[PDB]
Design a protein around this ligand. Structure first.
Ligand SMILES: Cc1ncc(C[n+]2csc(CCOP(=O)(O)OP(=O)(O)O)c2C)c(N)n1
Ligand SMILES: Cc1ncc(C[n+]2csc(CCOP(=O)(O)OP(=O)(O)O)c2C)c(N)n1
Ligand SMILES: [Cl-]
Ligand SMILES: [Cl-]
Ligand SMILES: [K+]
Ligand SMILES: [K+]
Ligand SMILES: [K+]
Ligand SMILES: [K+]
Ligand SMILES: [Mn+2]
Ligand SMILES: [Mn+2]
Lengths: 391, 329, 329, 391
């Protein structure tokens, strides 16, 4: 019997390399088919009508907002945008399975989580416009959302940096006996970063109540997954770190909900990490700087979409119809446009705010720089867009 | 001077440099995130079709891997041209750059090297890039013996400097001012040519004050020279530094001995910025010639903001106002 | 002044600081490579037994993870004291430090922060550390708004500064001069006390020249002051900078206005070293008082060598010779 | 049938997390038992007598050198040392399976590879002493060996940095149609680094002829593997990247040889990476700064050692005996002591060499610093240990 401390294993007396199973990988958990039909009744979460309508209205309201803000970017009204087309089911299915106070780390494609948590349209807008209502004080590029009240840690552009951070927050939660989970979203491209290997391993060895949620939508900007990895996606990586792992149909809000709900229950009870890889397709361009037709969509959009699938389910229950659909489409457009118009008309924050929060206090030498700008604007102010900024 | 030219913007001049490199050096390969389809700033358009998928290819999304991989290629003597998609995202690779690439030749007694590595990356402000698509990281690298750091101001400059970096026998970081990628075109030779590293360029002679900058900021100080001439009757000597390290101390000191005044400007934050190294060196070498304190007009000591960018940057008015005070000292 | 003291060397003073922290702050945890058994330099001896395995624990061997993990703990408001085993190995974490920790408060409009993070790491030459157990990385970090960088010169200084870092509401990097860990002991208060950050200390008053250094180099310039007094009849004002950023500009400028001469010294390489920022700032603020050029006596612009260390370091003879020339300028 | 680009898999209609198999992990390939007996004749490589005696004499000569240089460090004759006790079989078993011109990247525990490649005792010594014979010019700490002639890339102290480098060198070899492999050694602690995740993934996606060789000896300094990871060691990570993987008994030179020989054959023919995790035990302290009794050995040293095991095999073949053992022990001690004495008496390199090779050429400002040192030594030279250094 082998005695090595590094592994628990038997001897083998024949040379055999271990081959990865990539052709038939980890299977994809589904609850409803593309026609919104429940496949296996024992798996049906039987969520109540009001909750399921919330999933649906959250997704569609996000989609409405996406359409408008994408257009706003094209007109140069806002500088940048990233859509959620196809990520709506992963967002709202997982958010609905969390406790309200569970802490969320993400990046660019998680706005539906905030939407489900009732983040005001006014605040999504304020961040994209960098106006005086933005609690982020207009400092970050658009869609870099954050909300302390809704436990949604401010997004940052460097990919994967949130992954080991989320693990640290989860360790702290364990110690605090918070009975809280942390969830951490990231794309399949971001999973190639060194920080993903850091977070996965620390979460296992330090026994942290965290859900890793990877959105695998087949592309990282122009890069297909064939160039991103050669294993069986991200889910197959989890077991190598000792992490319980699952793969789900990301266009199925119920499969997403079931897997997240169970991951959350076990992560908190057992103080162990869970990895969920949600299979989707990025229907939109990567962002507003991207024309995705350069490197590759109608299949996914008309044949397999989270919103359409849930809409079919709703119809089967008698919980929605064409009239309700029309009325909601109108009401949601009105609500988004009201927030949009208000956001565009607000001033930007005082230019003084470029100097605060660098440190908690402002160092004397920094204050000196702030004073130098004030003097500068006194003399040369005509040359600056001051009429747009708060004073 | 250099044969047939054609109008090129800065991204096109980069493509031209890269094309010329792959044509004449069969070992050369280009890799990084999204380079295969032509890159997010178009710098590699056409090259994969022209040279083959084994020579222009995408990597996984991992900066520390891109640089470590590049170093490995270079260790075998093959030319490795790595791309880092934005300079802001070079930091995951900082260990590979500083502890490995820069020290590779020294620590081995020249038994091994990675001289045939070049890392190219978009750099500098772009109007709305905010914290992570605006940065100017050159001062971070300036404190690392063993690497070269090079920043062009125009398409003609970019192609000649990039060719020099690719051919230089030391690991080079070449920072491409992204706001210039699609700015005005200028005439650029179609065939390969070189501009020397560690050589500043006096682009306008002057007698009252020396102005030093690099990248897009060169165009700012050129405009400041014009403003000073018109409004103050002050003659400014305008210098593009071009290579951050090893830098051209002699060209700068010669100018300051003549003028007796120096203003250095860069987008990067003031504290620990590269203006500090130039100012302290000029002070040591030109002490007796200094009519006024050396002025540094830099970004403020904050992260680079989204909505406040117009107020953050060391623009021509900030530079002009500094110059006015220095002339009056 | 501070209650009962006992003789402590620098590693013991660090243990004392950490002990005092865990005792008074139930949120505080200490983690990194090999900290559980007491650390490779003994700084955490006894703490796991005293405070529990959930509070003093080993991580996997991954610097980028250690720092990202620390930031996460700090995001919840819990005090996170991360160790990086040698300062030379801080570079894998450079992205987490510069792009994340430093920018966390600003970029969120103060909705989130990691103020309760402190990163402590052994620093500076050790006689035979060569390229990777000798480095002084402070200038790399000095160009990053949003972090504080702090370096003590003695056990009493180390405990008071480290307590201040741990309690400061900003992410701090505390560099511990490892050659001092088991050097001479001095009296150190057993109970907690603080020394303010961003405050230099004039440790010896003088009238002819200002000498500035930090870490072990403080002891070098103190000896240089003695040599200057004895051999030249020159009165040196000796200043320990202590905090690299934000630095105490006022204390330094006040001294140079008085003396009219400044020599700055550090083990780190000259080019892009922190002496450049001090020299350029003093030049701007004290220009009219400068009797001679500000001198920088630094490590050479090479990687840190093994067998050549005695020839590399800016020792008392190199500093003295520079001072002699400056006094004679 | 699922359509997602990111993975190849079937649907599943029931929620099932994938559980890591850590209790019975990947089995440990063995060829000979602890008494040097061949277990499975079909696996016996039947290496010729001269080659097997080379494996044995390489291991023992390394061990002799280790004992002497470890003592030298304790006396302060050299500044630092790291022993190979227990890594001798992994070293020489794998080196013997490589082609002479296959490029090796490593770190601290690979000296046996150089020993097998006939690296002179004089040069091991010259590097540890930093003397004038050192081609590394005395610049690195002891045991940071390198040899361009023997295709052994200079070691550096930062852990794991060689892993993505080795992959790059392998990519270049593929392009060159070198018909060469690259091998890359690293410890189980170093495998936690972000650079390990970088190298493994790039090697798979870029299809590189590389062998990753992980020495799992149960500890990284004071840290047991229970704190290093929670998966089934390092071998279980390989398949998640699409890498063919195997685990071997690192105290069995033949198991090491067989697995390396097959990995090399397939890596070169197929341009694909192979991962070999060799299970060992670090018998010695981590280095000369370490007293390992602070955190944990006699079992491994007397019950399961690579040298003892091979010695037993040799006896069974009639290829060694007590007289030969005695004579070799004497001859090897004499050879190491001759090199040791010569190394200690050589001068160190000219102090001027602190300035060269920073760049290929020496920048004018660097030459200026070199001149400043020359002037300095002219005046203050009495204060420097100049009598020890070449002039
Ligand atoms: C460290 C770093 N490198 C590169 C980028 C540029 N970049 C922004 S998004 C992106 C692709 C991310 O792909 P993935 O993680 O799959 O997410 P998706 O956009 O498909 O949802 C890249 C390369 C970045 N933001 N951070
Ligand atoms: C980036 C980095 N961090 C930390 C160290 C300090 N260190 C030197 S060896 C070592 C343990 C390495 O363990 P492992 O990889 O298992 O190899 P082993 O010593 O067991 O053969 C550590 C933490 C280092 N050299 N590099
Ligand atoms: Cl981005
Ligand atoms: Cl080490
Ligand atoms: K992020
Ligand atoms: K080069
Ligand atoms: K702090
Ligand atoms: K290494
Ligand atoms: Mn993606
Ligand atoms: Mn180990």
């Amino acid at each position: 019997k082998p005695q090595f401390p590094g592994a628990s294993a038997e001897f083998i007396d024949k040379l055999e390399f271990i081959q990865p199973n990539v052709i038939s990988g980890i299977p994809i958990y589904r609850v409803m088919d593309r026609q919104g039909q429940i496949i296996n009744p024992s798996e049906d979460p039987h969520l109540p009508k009001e909750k399921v309508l919330k999933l649906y209205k959250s997704m569609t309201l996000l989609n409405t907002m996406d359409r408008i803000l994408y257009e706003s970017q094209r007109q140069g009204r806002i500088s940048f945008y990233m859509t959620n087309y196809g990520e709506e089911g992963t967002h709202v299915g997982s958010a609905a399975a969390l406790d309200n106070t569970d802490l969320v780390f993400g990046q660019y494609r998680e706005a539906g989580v905030l939407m489900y948590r009732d983040y005001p349209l006014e605040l999504f807008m304020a961040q994209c416009y960098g106006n005086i209502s933005d609690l982020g004080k207009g400092r970050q590029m658009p869609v870099h959302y954050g909300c302390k009240e809704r436990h949604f840690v401010t997004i940052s552009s460097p990919l994967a940096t949130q992954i080991p951070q989320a693990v640290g927050a989860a360790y702290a939660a364990k110690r605090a006996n918070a009975n809280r989970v942390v969830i951490c979203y990231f794309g399949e491209g971001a999973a190639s970063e060194g920080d993903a290997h850091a977070g996965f391993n620390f979460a296992a060895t330090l026994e942290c109540p965290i859900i890793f949620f990877c959105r695998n939508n087949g592309y990282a900007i122009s890069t297909p997954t064939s160039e991103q990895y050669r294993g069986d996606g991200i889910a197959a990586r989890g077991p190598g770190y000792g992490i319980m792992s699952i793969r789900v149909d990301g266009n199925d809000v119920f499969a997403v909900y079931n897997a997240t709900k169970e991951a959350r229950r076990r992560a908190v009870a057992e103080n162990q990490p869970f990895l969920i890889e949600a299979m989707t397709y990025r229907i939109g361009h990567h962002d507003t700087s991207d024309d995705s037709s350069a490197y590759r969509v109608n299949y996914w959009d008309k044949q397999d979409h989270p919103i359409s699938r849930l809409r079919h389910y709703l119809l089967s229950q008698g919980w929605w119809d064409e009239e309700q659909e029309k009325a909601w489409r109108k009401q949601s457009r009105r609500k988004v446009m009201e927030a949009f118009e208000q956001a565009e008309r607000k001033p930007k924050p005082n230019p003084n705010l470029l100097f605060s929060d660098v440190y908690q206090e402002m160092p004397a030498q920094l204050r000196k720089q702030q004073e130098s700008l004030a003097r500068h604007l006194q003399t040369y102010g005509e040359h600056y867009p001051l009429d747009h900024f708060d004073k | 001077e250099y044969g047939q030219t054609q109008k090129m913007n800065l991204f096109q001049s980069v493509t031209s440099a890269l094309d010329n490199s792959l044509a004449k050096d069969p070992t050369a390969v280009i890799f990084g995130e999204d380079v295969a389809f032509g890159g997010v700033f178009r710098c590699t358009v056409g090259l994969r079709d022209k040279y083959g998928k084994d020579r222009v290819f995408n990597t996984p999304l991992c900066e520390q891997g891109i640089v470590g991989f590049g170093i490995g290629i270079a260790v075998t003597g093959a030319t490795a041209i790595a791309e880092i998609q934005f300079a802001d995202y070079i930091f995951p690779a900082f260990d590979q750059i500083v502890n490995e690439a820069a020290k590779y030749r020294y620590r081995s007694g020249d038994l091994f090297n990675c001289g045939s590595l070049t890392i190219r990356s978009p750099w500098g402000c772009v109007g709305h890039g905010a914290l992570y698509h605006s940065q100017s990281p050159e001062a971070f690298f300036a404190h690392c013996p063993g690497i070269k750091v090079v920043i062009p101001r125009s398409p003609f400059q970019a192609k000649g400097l990039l060719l020099s970096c690719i051919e230089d026998k030391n690991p080079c970081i070449f920072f491409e001012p992204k706001i210039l990628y699609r700015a005005a075109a200028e005439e650029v030779p179609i065939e390969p040519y070189n501009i020397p590293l560690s050589q500043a360029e006096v682009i306008q002679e002057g007698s009252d004050v020396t102005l030093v900058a690099w990248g897009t900021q060169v165009h700012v100080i050129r405009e400041v020279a014009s403003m000073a001439k018109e409004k103050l009757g002050v003659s400014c000597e305008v210098i593009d530094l071009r290579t951050i390290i090893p830098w051209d101390v002699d060209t700068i000191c010669k100018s300051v001995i003549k003028t007796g005044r120096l203003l250095i400007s860069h987008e990067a934050p003031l504290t620990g910025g590269f203006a500090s190294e130039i100012s302290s060196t000029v002070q040591e070498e030109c002490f007796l010639n200094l009519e006024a304190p050396i002025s540094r007009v830099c970004g403020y000591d904050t992260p680079f903001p989204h909505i406040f960018e117009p107020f953050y940057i060391p623009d021509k008015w900030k530079c002009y106002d500094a110059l006015r005070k220095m002339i009056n000292y």
